[PDB]
Design a protein around this ligand. Structure first.
Ligand SMILES: CCCCCCCCCCCCCCCC(=O)OC[C@H](COP(=O)([O-])OCC[N+](C)(C)C)OC(=O)CCCCCCCCCCCCCCC
Ligand code: HEM
Ligand code: HEM
Ligand SMILES: COc1c(O)c(C)c(C/C=C(\C)CC/C=C(\C)CC/C=C(/C)CC/C=C(\C)CC/C=C(\C)CCC=C(C)C)c(O)c1OC
Ligand SMILES: CCCCCCCCCCCCCCC(=O)OCCCOP(=O)(O)OC[C@@H](O)COP(=O)(O)OCCCOC(C)=O
Ligand SMILES: CCCCCCCCCCCCCCC(=O)O[C@H](COC(=O)CCCCCCCCCCCC)COP(=O)(O)O
Ligand SMILES: CCCCCCCCCCCCCC(=O)O[C@H](COC(=O)CCCCCCCCCCC)COP(=O)(O)O
Lengths: 62, 64, 126, 431, 54, 55, 51, 110, 126
């Protein structure tokens, strides 16, 4: 078999590319992973920064 | 006789073959059938069964 | 770190004896296909680690046509194991195609570094 | 300077030039390497070499006629050039030994002596011409499983299956009167050519070439023909371009004229106006690169082909080039367009208006087959004078911002990184 | 298109990731508190505070 | 402060911070010898020192 | 026939001034994410019509 | 060349986490090295923010761990992320010393 | 970072003016021997910092016979400074051997890179 006959990728390939639709779906699931890694990363740097604030006992003697 | 480079692998090649050529090969094959058999070569013998009794158009399955 | 001269000294003692060849060669055959490097499409002499300088030597003395195929069955194995699959049962290395092709290039590089150290400690009797 | 057309059942095109001293006359067919299956592939290349065979060119040399031929993706060509006083002696040759009789060329001696002489040229192409066997492997993987992926020369594995039956079966299907253009360039008047087809007959066939079932469709892929025993690393990388008769045809040619061509060894191609050359000269990442905008009937290509001895810094050549393609979308300057206007008008002023008539007859027949008439140069200069900076930005954001790419490489392309580190270079992540 | 507005410029891709994680922060916090209290009706303090009705 | 004036939350966090930062300085000095080693030390004449080097 | 330049061009600055303002908005939208729950910044952060 | 290769600091980032050629067949047991790097930052960052409230005398040791778990905002998070995360350090590491003991990563030249 | 094209514009305006050349040229050579680079045996163009590509260029276009002397007066100054001495009075660079030997190679390689930046930034009219 020559090197110009590319093998079958037909059971992996899409049936309709539409390159503005297959790319507006890959950047959706990437963007959804970045959307919960911002709610999950505000709520991590809020845990450590608010832990350095006034504790419960030193608030009581105000 | 019929050349090797027209009936080689008439399984993946019957569909997406142009339609004027697609019934040109059944015209050449129908003249090779007016002979005593077992003189047709095997790429010419197994590729007349695919035309009459293959899986394309009719005899396509209901589900892919 | 087992020095193939020492393997083949033990290994040829087993095959030479009629009793031990009847006994532990059928154990050796069942051990080979239970390992299953054939199913990844490798011979055994792709599996040998190539970082000692003896085995680094014997991969330069190899001919070009065998060092091109050996450099392909490795890449088919890094591609098959990447998909967590096996090779299809036609592509498996059969029994006759599993021959020690790199064994004689090692036993002439091992005996050439054994002689280099037997001669670097020679004590001349005056 | 004017080109006319007629029709008699067969189209007659003529670009008369009353200054030159030769007169090319030939037929140009509408089939190419995009009109054959991968099992008879190379029958278009094998028909050129029995037209240029020894017996057929010995009879043509007796009257003082030199035979040329060209096999491309979309069109074939069979031109017979001669002196200006032989506008009928070349038609009488072309009607005799190409159209009327084919049992002289396709004998059992002349076919076997030509089948061994193409197989020679293909084998010495596949292993000895590296910057062009990549461009075949770029088409063979950008448009794979589709008629625009077949090589024009034919694969070597399919070229040794061809018998004279497949040579004649291609002739009856594609050398037809509805598919042909009898073209004539050089020092021939138009009225002498059309009267010399009517005084002869020159009929080929009936018509109805077979229509393809699959159109051309780009598929972003890669292929690595790596070979460590080669002293360089050739790389062709491309996106889907504009086909011919597109409204963005000349924008895609001006977009590749911006990054132009380069040769590192010339002292005058190192002082060009491309901004890419400042990043490429500090460590000498390449020896040459040319940017192409190919344009076929159904689809096209757009990208660049390169060659490199610096095999460790390939991934800085591809990165620094592709970060200049992104400048087309976002921040291309007006001077980079006003320069590439003036070079493109010189680029295709030397292609359509050189001296050679047998090159003009290749580019006249390949245009009236598709468009129906040849677009003149004085009017195609007004289509480049009206390209703005916004039209390149509107084109580039459609065609190459974040689009898929097709890669083909050979040589020592170990240093070439894999697909998603090149495909992700198309978008800048800061725009 | 949809790609030409949102996912083309990266300056407006991460603009609507942060504007979609700012809405998700206040909505998902309210919709968990309003579920977790409703799952334990009768056991929280403001249910005991109302049931001390004398 | 961790409160309303300099108190027990402050001195307790000014010690655990003060223990830390000399292991940031000791990892910024390694980032300071790396930027020096690519071009070498200067010399009090202000001319190149690539001619007469000693180990 | 000369452009203003300091290795950055004035013609290449006005090609980013759209996208430099869109990046200022994508940072103020990133500042509002991480600095809510700050009760001082909630004087202008529950002025919104829901939430 | 590229700025990730041309800088003195970024080429240490480039040659280790961006351009480092890893073999293309390594399974998921090769992630335990990257987890131990994350699990080390978890112990260190939840050690600094916890040792701002910890007095180390024998009278105030146990009484100031309970001061973390009762009086500091999100103090129960820090003490539990770091007492359990230290026990997840040794479980990832025991699976990291057993990958290398299985796949022969101890042999020469390593 | 002063760009010798600039100081040759201010310098050649001072030299051509008859009032300023009487006034601040006697201050200039008094500044030179107070600087004391001749006492280590250096001409002034040894001192120009050679780590920018406009001056690393002009050190390749220097002829071979002057780029061997310049490579000696530098090592003669590195050797004299680490003994913390000065060169003897018969080895000091005199007032006439202190010539601008690297000024024409700099000024022609500095005005040939000003021209390169006035050609990447041309706004050609229609
Ligand atoms: C530390 C943990 C903090 C996490 C904060 C996450 C903030 C958002 C990150 C996710 C995000 O929005 O990523 C978008 C960009 C681009 O990532 P991309 O996948 O290449 O996007 C396609 C590029 N277009 C076509 C849009 C031009 O991606 C980036 O800008 C990459 C940033 C990665 C930060 C780590
Ligand atoms: C913990 C503090 C520091 C350490 C361990 C340190 C270490 C060093 C060392 C070992 C050298 C090479 C020896 C030498 O050239 O003198 C050096 C050079 C240098 N340091 Fe520091 N340094 C420190 C602080 C600083 C500071 C605070 C500055 C400037 C604000 C600085 C600027 C420099 C410079 C410019 C050089 C190069 C001098 C030359 O080579 O001519 N360093 N440093
Ligand atoms: C490899 C890194 C570390 C490991 C495995 C580790 C492990 C532990 C363990 C097992 C405990 C006992 C937890 C318990 O039983 O409650 C502990 C407690 C503690 N560690 Fe770490 N630690 C690490 C790093 C650090 C660092 C960097 C700091 C301080 C800057 C730190 C400060 C503390 C403190 C203050 C306690 C307080 C007692 C407690 O509340 O548990 N640790 N650590
Ligand atoms: C071989 O290829 C690689 C590879 O190269 C690397 C790097 C990694 C990743 C491994 C690592 C990154 C491990 C290295 C870990 C360290 C160097 C630990 C350093 C961690 C720290 C947290 C440093 C300490 C610094 C601080 C604690 C500063 C934080 C400041 C604090 C807490 C004070 C806050 C106070 C105020 C006022 C804000 C891989 O996993 C890997 O395989 C894929
Ligand atoms: C006179 C005083 C005597 C006192 C003696 C006490 C001090 C002894 C000196 C110890 C060494 C001090 C300098 C350490 C240092 O700067 O090296 C850190 C790595 C720098 O590597 P490089 O040489 O810049 O890169 C050159 C490369 O070839 C080697 O780079 P690579 O090794 O890969 O970098 C590792 C960084 C890892 O970082 C990360 C992110 O993983
Ligand atoms: C330091 C101690 C070790 C920590 C182990 C963490 C190893 C993995 C790090 C993941 C960083 C992902 C960045 C990749 C990237 O930017 O690719 C960018 C874009 O990728 C993305 O958009 C991913 C969305 C953002 C993911 C947010 C993950 C944050 C979670 C942090 C958890 C670990 C601290 C470039 O990717 P491209 O070249 O294919 O275009
Ligand atoms: C710095 C190392 C931190 C690693 C934590 C890993 C262990 C998971 C437990 C997390 C508990 C602390 C978070 C929390 O209490 O928030 C809780 C919410 O849960 C989460 O969001 C966890 C998501 C973590 C995603 C991490 C993304 C990467 C961030 C990198 C650092 C910038 C409570 O949120 P709230 O205070 O109510 O806003």
């Amino acid at each position: 078999k020559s090197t110009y006959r590319t093998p079958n990728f037909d059971d992996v390939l899409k049936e309709n590319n539409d390159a503005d639709k297959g790319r507006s779906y890959a950047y959706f699931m990437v963007g959804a992973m970045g959307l919960l890694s911002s709610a999950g990363a505000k709520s991590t740097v809020e845990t450590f920064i608010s832990s350095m604030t006034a504790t419960a006992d030193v608030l009581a003697m105000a | 006789a019929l050349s090797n480079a027209a009936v080689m692998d008439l399984q993946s090649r019957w569909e997406n073959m142009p339609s004027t050529e697609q019934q040109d090969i059944v015209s050449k094959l129908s003249e090779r059938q007016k002979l005593p058999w077992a003189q047709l070569t095997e790429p010419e013998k197994q590729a007349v069964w695919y035309i009459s009794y293959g899986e394309w158009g009719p005899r396509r399955p209901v589900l892919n | 770190p087992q020095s193939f001269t020492s393997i083949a000294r033990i290994g040829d003692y087993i095959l030479k004896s009629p009793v031990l060849s009847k006994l532990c060669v059928p154990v050796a055959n069942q051990f080979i296909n239970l390992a299953g490097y054939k199913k990844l499409g490798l011979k055994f002499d792709d599996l040998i680690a190539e970082e000692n300088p003896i085995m680094q030597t014997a991969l330069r003395r190899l001919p070009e046509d065998e060092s091109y195929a050996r450099a392909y069955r490795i890449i088919r194995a890094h591609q098959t194991e990447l998909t967590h699959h096996l090779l299809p049962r036609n592509e498996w290395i059969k029994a006759q195609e599993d021959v020690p092709y790199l064994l004689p290039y090692i036993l002439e590089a091992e005996a050439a570094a054994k002689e280099k150290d037997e001669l670097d400690n020679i004590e001349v009797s005056k | 300077a004017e080109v006319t057309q007629l029709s008699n059942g067969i189209v007659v095109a003529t670009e008369h030039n009353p200054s030159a001293h030769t007169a090319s006359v030939g037929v140009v067919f509408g089939s190419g390497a995009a009109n054959e299956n991968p099992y008879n592939n190379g029958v278009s290349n094998l028909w050129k070499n029995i037209f240029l065979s020894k017996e057929n060119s010995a009879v043509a040399a007796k009257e003082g006629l030199a035979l040329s031929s060209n096999i491309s993706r979309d069109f074939q060509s069979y031109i017979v050039s001669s002196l200006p006083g032989s506008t009928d002696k070349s038609l009488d040759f072309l009607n005799q030994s190409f159209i009327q009789q084919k049992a002289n060329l396709l004998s059992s001696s002349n076919f076997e002596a030509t089948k061994k002489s193409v197989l020679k040229q293909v084998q010495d192409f596949e292993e000895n011409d590296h910057p062009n066997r990549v461009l075949e492997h770029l088409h063979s993987t950008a448009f794979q499983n589709t008629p625009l992926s077949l090589p024009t020369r034919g694969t070597l594995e399919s070229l040794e299956n061809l018998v004279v039956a497949d040579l004649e079966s291609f002739a009856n299907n594609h050398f037809l009167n509805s598919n042909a253009v009898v073209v004539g360039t050089g020092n021939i008047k138009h009225e002498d050519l059309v009267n010399s087809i009517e005084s002869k007959n020159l009929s080929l066939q009936t018509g109805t070439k077979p229509v393809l079932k699959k159109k051309a469709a780009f598929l972003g892929s890669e292929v690595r023909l790596r070979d460590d025993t080669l002293p360089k690393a050739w790389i062709s990388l491309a996106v889907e371009g504009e086909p011919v008769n597109s409204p963005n045809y000349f924008v895609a040619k001006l977009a590749a004229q911006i990054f132009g061509s380069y040769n590192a060894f010339e002292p005058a191609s190192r002082l060009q106006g491309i901004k890419l050359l400042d990043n490429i000269q500090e460590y000498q990442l390449c020896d040459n690169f040319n940017h192409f905008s190919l344009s076929y009937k159904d689809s096209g290509l757009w990208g660049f082909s390169t060659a490199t001895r610096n095999v460790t810094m390939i991934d800085d050549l591809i990165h620094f080039t592709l970060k200049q393609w992104n400048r087309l979308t976002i921040s291309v300057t007006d001077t980079e367009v006003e320069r590439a206007k003036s070079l493109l008008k010189l680029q295709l002023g030397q292609l359509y208006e050189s001296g050679n008539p047998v090159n003009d007859a290749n580019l006249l027949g390949a245009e009236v087959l598709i468009k129906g008439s040849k677009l003149s140069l004085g009017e195609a200069f007004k289509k480049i004078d009206a390209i703005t900076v916004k039209d390149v930005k509107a084109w580039a954001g459609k065609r190459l911002w974040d689009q898929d790419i097709a890669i083909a490489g050979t040589g020592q392309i170990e240093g070439l990184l894999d697909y998603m580190r090149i495909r992700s270079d198309m978008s800048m992540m800061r725009w | 298109s949809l790609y030409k507005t949102f996912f083309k410029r990266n300056a407006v891709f991460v603009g609507t990731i942060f504007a979609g994680a700012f809405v998700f922060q206040t909505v998902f916090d309210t919709a968990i508190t309003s579920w977790y209290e409703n799952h334990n009706k009768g056991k929280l303090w403001k249910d005991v505070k109302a049931r001390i009705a004398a | 402060w961790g409160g309303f004036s300099v108190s027990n939350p402050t001195i307790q966090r000014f010690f655990a911070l003060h223990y830390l930062v000399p292991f940031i300085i000791a990892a910024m000095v390694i980032m300071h010898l790396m930027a020096l080693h690519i071009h070498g030390s200067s010399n009090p004449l202000g001319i190149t020192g690539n001619l007469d080097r000693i180990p | 026939t000369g452009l203003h330049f300091g290795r950055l061009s004035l013609r290449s600055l006005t090609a980013y001034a759209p996208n430099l303002m869109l990046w200022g908005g994508a940072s103020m939208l990133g500042l509002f994410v991480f600095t809510e729950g700050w009760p001082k910044f909630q004087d202008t952060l529950y002025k919104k019509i829901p939430l | 060349m590229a700025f990730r290769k041309s800088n003195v600091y970024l080429s240490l980032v480039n040659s280790y986490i961006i351009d480092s050629p890893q073999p293309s067949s390594i399974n998921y047991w090769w992630n335990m090295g990257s987890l131990l790097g994350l699990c080390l930052v978890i112990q260190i960052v939840t050690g600094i923010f916890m040792a701002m409230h910890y007095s180390s005398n024998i009278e105030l040791a146990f009484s100031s761990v309970e001061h973390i778990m009762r009086d500091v905002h999100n103090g129960y998070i820090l003490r539990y992320l770091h007492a359990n995360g230290a026990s997840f350090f040794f479980m990832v590491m025991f699976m990291h010393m057993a990958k290398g003991l299985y796949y022969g990563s101890y042999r020469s030249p390593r």
